[PDB]
Amino acid sequence: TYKFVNMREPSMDMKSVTDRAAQTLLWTELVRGLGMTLSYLFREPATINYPFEKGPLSPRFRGEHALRRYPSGEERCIACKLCEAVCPAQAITIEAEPRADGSRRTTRYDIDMTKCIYCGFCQEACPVDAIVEGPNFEFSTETHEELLYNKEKLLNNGDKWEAEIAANIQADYLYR
Amino acid sequence: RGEYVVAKLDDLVNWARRSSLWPMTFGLACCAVEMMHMAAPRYDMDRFGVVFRASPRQSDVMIVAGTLTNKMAPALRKVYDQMPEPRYVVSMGSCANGGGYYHYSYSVVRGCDRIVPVDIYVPGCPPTAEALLYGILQLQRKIKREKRLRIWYRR
Amino acid sequence: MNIMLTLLTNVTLASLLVLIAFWLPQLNAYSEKTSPYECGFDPMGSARLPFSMKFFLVAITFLLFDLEIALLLPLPWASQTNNLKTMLTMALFLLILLAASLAYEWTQKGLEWAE
Amino acid sequence: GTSVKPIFSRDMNEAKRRVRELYRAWYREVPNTVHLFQLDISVKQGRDKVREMFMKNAHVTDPRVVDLLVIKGKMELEETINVWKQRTHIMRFFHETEAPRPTDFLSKFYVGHDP
Amino acid sequence: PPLTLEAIKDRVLYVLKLYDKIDPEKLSVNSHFMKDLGLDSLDQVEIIMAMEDEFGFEIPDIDAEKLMCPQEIVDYIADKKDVYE
Lengths: 176, 155, 115, 115, 85
Ligand SMILES: COC1=C(OC)C(=O)C(C/C=C(\C)CC/C=C(\C)CC/C=C(\C)CC/C=C(\C)CC/C=C(/C)CC/C=C(/C)CC/C=C(\C)CC/C=C(\C)CC/C=C(\C)CCC=C(C)C)=C(C)C1=O
Ligand code: SF4
Ligand code: SF4
Ligand code: SF4
Prior knowledge:
The structure is cut from a larger assembly and holds chains A (176 residues), B (155 residues), C (115 residues), D (115 residues) and E (85 residues).
Chain A: H1 14-25, H2 29-41, E1 65-67, H3 82-86, E2 92-98, E3 104-112, H4 121-125, E4 131-133, E5 148-149, H5 151-160, H6 162-170
Antiparallel strand pairs in A: 1-4, 2-3, 3-5
Chain B: H1 2-19, H2 31-37, E1 61-65, H3 73-82, E2 88-92, H4 93-97, E3 120-122, H5 129-144, H6 148-153
Parallel strand pairs in B: 1-2, 2-3
Helix pairs in contact in B: 1-5
Chain D: H1 12-36, H2 44-56, H3 63-81, H4 87-91, H5 105-111
Helix pairs in contact in D: 1-2, 1-3
The complex binds ubiquinone-10 and iron/sulfur cluster (3 copies).
Protein name (chain A): NADH dehydrogenase [ubiquinone] iron-sulfur protein 8, mitochondrial
Catalytic activity (chain A): a ubiquinone + NADH + 5 H(+)(in) = a ubiquinol + NAD(+) + 4 H(+)(out)
GO molecular function, one term (chain A): metal ion binding
C-alpha cells in the first residue's frame, strides 16, 4: 500500500481560480501562519524552573558511578573484574590483593569518568550489585583531574547516595 | 574607600558577564543534541540569559559538545583564537572531556583540553540537558567569583 | 540653528560610544585573534577579488527607475494647478512609460538574473 | 609468478620520469606555499625539505612502488595547492616541537632501555 | 635586439653560476654536471628549471634528460629560438 503525497491537480472553476487569486493577492495562508503562532503564544509555556524544578527521571537512570556495600558494612565488591572485563571503553582499572582478614577486595578500583560512556554494562555484569550507576548527574568539575575517580571517591559516592541507590534498586531489581 | 569602589565595579562587571553569557553554535556530535534540548522549551537557555550566537567574534563560552578529532582540532583551536576575551570553554561529554568511547582511536584528540584551556568539564555520554545546564550555572558562579579589578588594585 | 545642532548631537554621541567601546574594555590582541574568519579553517585568500553580481542589469536599471521618481515626486504640488487635464495626461504618460520600460525588461530577459 | 601487473609505468625509467615531474611540480610550488600559507620558513628552507623527502625513499626499486608514491605525492601536492592542508598540516613536515633524538649508543643507554 | 650564441651562452653561465651546489671554478662550458661538477639528476632538474624561467620558454621533460652538460644546454636553447650564428 502506497499513497501519492503530492498528486493533487487544482480545480479550474471560476470560483476556484478566484479563491487562488484572492489567496495570492490577499495573503491568506500567511494569515493562517500568523494565527497559529498567535494561538501558541496565548498557550502555556513548557519551561521548568531549574534548578528549583527538575525534569522527571526514572529509577533506571544512569549517572555517577558508585560502589555500594552490604548492610553490615563490608563492601560488596570482591574484585571478580567482570565490570573491568565488560566495560566497552576500558574505563575501569582494578588491582586486587587478599586483605588482612582474608577476603579478596580491590587494592585499587579506579573508574575514569572522562572515558566512561555511562552504558551501565558494569552494573549488569556485577554479580553482587557492588558497582552501580547512581542517580546523580550534577557532578560537573572545573578541572579534568577531578573526573578521574579513585576507590575512595567511589566509596564516598556509595556512602552518600546509598539512600537513593538502595531505593532505586529496590524498585527495579525485579525487572532485571 | 578605593577597595569598596573596585569591589562594586567587580560585582557589576562580573554580573554582566555571567548574566549575558553568549554561547557558540559549535555542536559536533550527539552531545550537540542535548545542547539543543536545553535550548528546547523544557529547559530554555534563554531565561538564564544565554542565547546561541554563531560567528565567534560575538560569543563568550564555547561548549565543545562531541568528539574532537585530529582533522577538526586545528579548526577548533583557530576558532577559539577568534574569540575576543574574556572567553570560556565548557567541555560537554566524555569524548570532548578525555576521549570517551574512542579514546584509543588513531584520529581522536584525547581530550579537548589538549587544544584549548577548558574551563568547565561537563561529564556524560551524553550529559543530560539538566547536567549541561548545571555546568553552565557552575561557569556562571565561576564568573561571579572573579576578582579582576581587585587584583588590579593590588597590582 | 536646530538641524545641525541635532546632527552634531547624534554624531558626537555615536563617536563617544565608539570611544568608550574601544578604550575601556582592556583588549589583549594577538595575530591569530584578528585572523579573518572563514568558518574555522584558514581562508583560501581573497575578500577583494572580483565578486560577480548577476543582477548587474537589474542593478543599473534601478538607477533609471529611481531617477524617474525625481520627475514623479513634484506631483503633490502639481495636482494643485489650473490645467488638470494636461497634468493628468503627463503624469499618466510618465507612469505608462515606466510600465513600458519594465515590460520591455521583463520580456527581454532583463529582470531575470544571469547564471 | 615472477611477473605481475604494472600500476602506471612499465620500467624503472618511466617511474623515474614520473618522480622527476612530481619534483618539478613541488619545486615550482614551494614559494607559493610560503606566500599563500603565510609560512615563516625561508623558500629554500622548504625546497631542501622537498629534496629530503624525495631522498628519503630513494632506495625503493620495485616500479609499482614508485608509481604508488608518485600518486601519493601527487595527492599531497593536490592538498597543498587548493589550501586543503593548513599551516599546522604543512608545518608537520618540519618536526619542530620534537626534541632532537640521539644517534650514538651511549646516549641511548644513558636515557632509557630501547634499541 | 636580436641575440645569438654569445647571449645564450652568457645567460646560461650566469644562471648556472647562481646555483650554490655548482662550483665556481670547475664550472665551464665543458663541465658536465654528472662528471665534472658531481651533481644529482634531481639537481639537473633545477639546472633545466633555471634554464626555463629566465629563458622564458619552458623545456619539457622528454628532452630535459638529454641536456646533461652546458654545451648541450646552449645548443638546445639555440635551436629553440632559431639561432644560426
Ligand atoms: C543535523 O545535525 C546537526 C548537528 O549535528 C551534530 C549540529 O551540531 C548542528 C549545530 C548545532 C547547533 C547550531 C546548536 C543548536 C542551536 C540552536 C537550537 C539555537 C538556539 C537559539 C536560541 C535559543 C536563541 C535564539 C535567539 C532569539 C530568539 C532572539 C535573539 C535576539 C536578541 C536581540 C539577542 C540579544 C542581543 C543583543 C545584542 C541585544 C542586547 C543589547 C542591548 C540591549 C544594548 C543596550 C544599550 C544601551 C541601553 C545603551 C544606553 C545608552 C545611553 C542611555 C546613553 C549612551 C551615551 C553615552 C555618551 C555613553 C546542527 C545545526 C545540526 O543540524
Ligand atoms: S557504566 Fe561507565 S563504568 Fe560501567 S561499563 Fe559503562 S562506561 Fe564503564
Ligand atoms: S563486577 Fe562488581 S564485584 Fe566484580 S570487580 Fe567489578 S565492582 Fe567488584
Ligand atoms: S561523550 Fe558520548 S555522547 Fe558525547 S560525543 Fe562522545 S560518545 Fe557521543
